[PDB]
Amino acid sequence: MRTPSTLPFTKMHGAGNDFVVLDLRDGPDPSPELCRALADRHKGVGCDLVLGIREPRSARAVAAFDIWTADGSRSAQCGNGARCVAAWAVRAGLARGPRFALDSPSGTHEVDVLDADTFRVALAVPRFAPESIPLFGHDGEQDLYEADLGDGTRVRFAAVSMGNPHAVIEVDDTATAPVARVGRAVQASGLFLPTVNVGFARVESRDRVHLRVHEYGAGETLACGSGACAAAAVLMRRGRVDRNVSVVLPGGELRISWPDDAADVLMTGPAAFVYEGTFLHASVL
Amino acid sequence: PSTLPFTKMHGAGNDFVVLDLRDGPDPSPELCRALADRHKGVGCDLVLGIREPRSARAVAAFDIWTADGSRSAQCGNGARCVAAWAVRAGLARGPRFALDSPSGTHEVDVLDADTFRVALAVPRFAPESIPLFGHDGEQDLYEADLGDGTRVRFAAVSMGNPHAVIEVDDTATAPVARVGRAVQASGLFLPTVNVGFARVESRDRVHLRVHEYGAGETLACGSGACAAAAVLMRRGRVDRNVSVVLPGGELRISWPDDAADVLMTGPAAFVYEGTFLHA
């Protein structure tokens, strides 16, 4: 039922972090050229990430997925995307049952189906040691570190690795924060790897946290799952919120659970099917 | 109804969701907004709806909705995309035909599979036709100190919609959003004026950025390109056939004589076919 010259796809999003999902089983990977075209919001389809679904690699998983950014390069992990792959897998008959595993580029992740739209994904175990983030110029683990980013920009932040590095800055109001400017400053500070994602968090209660994230490469999007998990863990590590907490992002709301310091952070949230598509003249770019 | 077939197209990066409305209701404001949402919907500058023709001449009409669900009286790049759509659907057979827009009837020449020349409108420079306020009896280059401290020298023309055309030394560094909004709020024009920032490279070539009503800048504004060309032709600065380079692509503009329609040649592209799932 696949017309030659065309590429079927599914447009999805997880809390406004949006994806072009391809079924890559028994065929090639998309070239970088094709990924770039797919992600072009005006002349292509438009998305934060291209996700390609294949047969499982691990013994237990029901499907595997790979990830491409809007410039065509591969990416090692994605938070919101995993929920969309899970929903897509359920819809395609790949994944039956309340619980199943998915292979990402970097690991195998257990998924719980909470309802048709809601999926819970184990992401990673937070690492706080300055040595594992790495947090340069710091040796003792601390709840908060302090950065002099030049006169007029003094920043107090927490630090944690979720596979990717994260700086978490508490704010009076997130809608409000110099996300792009301070996020770029922290990224260029040399306190972290240049890949650090900078979150700006406002604690509404022990149950509810508001967050914006300046992400490496993309900059800010509507939702950064890794950053949400990082903000939650940091605020839990310092006793500010409960071990189950809602994180409110521009594009949607997630529920983060971290039952034990040695356990994986769990990320619950929505997955949405937006439209089905057929990209024309897929060989002509 | 349940799901909704659509076609995604663009004209020089000005992008559209095209619906076939020939026997169904118009998209609601709510549907238009969901359709235009780039992250949680389809994503487009405008929604276009194909309808049966109104004029004796045309093979099809089309209506236009903005990303907030309100209707729009015309669109230059969209017309080329409607032309391509109409050819593909078998509505228009040979290399020329007419299309009804919400505000007129437009001759289309099919130059090749992806290239269409469309007659936009006859330029009107009379201050009372723009309408120009405060002036409204004066036809020349104008100068005005806007309410935001900027002094601007600009030409005025109506292509159906109003246009202010400002010459600059460099389109890349021009204050398109700031001065474009200043001009719209000025009261020299209806708030609906599109504000162009044009650098003349040669008599054959013009670079342009346009601050549009409502949307702000996009990758291409066809009516703005026609307005900038007609202004610079009346000002004697360019030939009656001129290329207008926009952020998303290039258009070829011709205005054979002062009573003629301005003709706008440029690309139209099909990107993908889609089924919107509502749910």
Side-chain angles (χ1 to χ4, degrees):
Chain A
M1 30 196 68
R2 170 167 174 173
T3 304
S5 86
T6 72
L7 171 62
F9 67 92
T10 303
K11 190 73 206 304
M12 307 183 69
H13 73 88
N17 186 196
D18 65 330
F19 316 108
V20 165
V21 184
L22 314 173
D23 181 358
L24 296 178
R25 290 173 296 172
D26 312 315
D29 280 343
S31 71
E33 293 65 35
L34 180 53
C35 295
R36 284 192 290 268
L38 286 173
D40 189 323
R41 285 181 194 281
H42 289 98
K43 294 178 189 205
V45 175
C47 61
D48 288 327
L49 301 171
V50 175
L51 314 171
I53 300 182
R54 285 188 188 279
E55 308 286 20
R57 272 179 288 109
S58 79
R60 56 193 185 275
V62 303
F65 70 96
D66 286 313
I67 302 151
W68 294 262
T69 56
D71 78 341
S73 53
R74 281 159 203 273
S75 203
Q77 50 178 88
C78 75
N80 299 302
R83 300 198 303 282
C84 287
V85 176
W88 192 102
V90 166
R91 187 164 277 200
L94 276 202
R96 289 171 218 296
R99 183 159 167 105
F100 55 89
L102 293 179
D103 300 318
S104 80
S106 73
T108 301
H109 316 260
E110 301 294 328
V111 180
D112 301 299
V113 179
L114 273 59
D115 62 41
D117 303 335
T118 315
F119 302 83
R120 177 165 63 215
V121 192
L123 176 81
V125 171
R127 303 308 172 167
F128 292 93
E131 40 159 6
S132 322
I133 293 158
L135 178 62
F136 302 106
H138 288 91
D139 162 58
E141 165 169 345
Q142 305 187 135
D143 291 339
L144 299 157
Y145 312 90
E146 192 149 359
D148 185 317
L149 303 180
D151 191 42
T153 308
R154 169 84 61 53
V155 180
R156 293 203 101 228
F157 64 93
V160 66
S161 174
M162 294 294 311
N164 44 357
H166 295 263
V168 178
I169 296 153
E170 204 174 327
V171 293
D172 279 336
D173 179 84
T174 62
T176 284
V179 167
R181 286 188 199 269
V182 172
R184 272 194 291 279
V186 171
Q187 281 171 345
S189 83
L191 290 166
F192 293 87
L193 288 189
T195 49
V196 59
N197 306 278
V198 192
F200 298 77
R202 170 207 154 217
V203 181
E204 180 202 315
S205 70
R206 285 189 72 79
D207 186 63
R208 206 166 161 83
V209 171
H210 298 258
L211 184 66
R212 298 171 64 191
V213 178
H214 176 84
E215 306 164 27
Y216 166 75
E220 187 177 0
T221 74
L222 285 179
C224 175
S226 76
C229 291
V234 152
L235 293 163
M236 286 171 196
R237 185 86 155 189
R238 98 155 62 111
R240 194 41 191 101
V241 304
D242 300 333
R243 310 284 303 206
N244 303 282
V245 70
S246 308
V247 178
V248 188
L249 298 149
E253 165 164 1
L254 305 177
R255 183 77 175 173
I256 312 301
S257 165
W258 189 36
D260 182 271
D261 278 57
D264 290 321
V265 172
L266 310 177
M267 174 164 60
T268 298
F273 293 92
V274 181
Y275 63 85
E276 307 292 335
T278 66
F279 187 85
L280 300 181
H281 307 295
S283 300
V284 186
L285 305 171
Chain B
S2 41
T3 65
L4 171 68
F6 72 92
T7 301
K8 186 74 205 290
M9 310 189 65
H10 74 91
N14 185 200
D15 68 329
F16 315 113
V17 168
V18 184
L19 309 173
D20 187 359
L21 301 189
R22 280 176 294 167
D23 41 51
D26 282 3
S28 67
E30 297 63 40
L31 178 49
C32 288
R33 284 193 284 271
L35 282 173
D37 189 321
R38 301 210 177 254
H39 293 93
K40 304 183 176 184
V42 175
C44 57
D45 292 327
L46 306 176
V47 174
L48 309 173
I50 307 299
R51 304 241 201 71
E52 306 294 336
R54 264 184 326 276
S55 67
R57 215 187 157 90
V59 306
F62 69 104
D63 213 341
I64 317 167
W65 294 264
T66 66
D68 77 3
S70 70
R71 290 166 83 220
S72 181
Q74 241 268 82
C75 71
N77 299 310
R80 297 197 312 275
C81 284
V82 172
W85 197 101
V87 168
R88 184 177 77 162
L91 296 190
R93 289 277 202 258
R96 58 224 159 281
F97 53 93
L99 289 177
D100 300 324
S101 75
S103 74
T105 295
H106 314 267
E107 285 311 298
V108 179
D109 314 286
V110 181
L111 308 201
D112 67 35
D114 323 301
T115 309
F116 305 79
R117 177 176 34 163
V118 187
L120 190 58
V122 172
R124 296 270 171 252
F125 300 93
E128 46 275 322
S129 270
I130 302 263
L132 249 190
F133 306 95
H135 320 269
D136 228 344
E138 274 80 60
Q139 182 204 326
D140 193 349
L141 176 68
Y142 312 97
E143 194 185 67
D145 303 331
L146 314 170
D148 87 320
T150 326
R151 168 169 301 167
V152 68
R153 292 207 75 105
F154 69 91
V157 64
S158 169
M159 287 310 297
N161 43 358
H163 300 266
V165 170
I166 296 153
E167 210 169 321
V168 296
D169 293 332
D170 184 354
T171 60
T173 75
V176 171
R178 173 175 62 79
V179 177
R181 183 54 233 163
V183 167
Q184 290 175 330
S186 85
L188 302 160
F189 292 97
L190 299 173
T192 206
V193 59
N194 305 282
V195 188
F197 298 80
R199 162 173 82 79
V200 176
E201 194 202 317
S202 61
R203 301 203 47 85
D204 190 63
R205 198 147 216 254
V206 171
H207 301 258
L208 183 68
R209 296 180 52 195
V210 178
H211 175 93
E212 310 173 27
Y213 172 75
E217 194 177 3
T218 77
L219 292 175
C221 172
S223 68
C226 286
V231 152
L232 295 165
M233 290 178 190
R234 180 55 74 71
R235 280 226 312 276
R237 285 286 294 310
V238 298
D239 297 330
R240 304 298 287 220
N241 299 275
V242 74
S243 303
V244 173
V245 180
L246 298 156
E250 195 169 307
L251 307 175
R252 184 80 180 170
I253 310 294
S254 153
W255 187 33
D257 64 81
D258 282 1
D261 287 292
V262 176
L263 304 173
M264 182 202 55
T265 295
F270 296 92
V271 183
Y272 66 86
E273 303 300 327
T275 300
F276 195 74
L277 299 164
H278 274 238

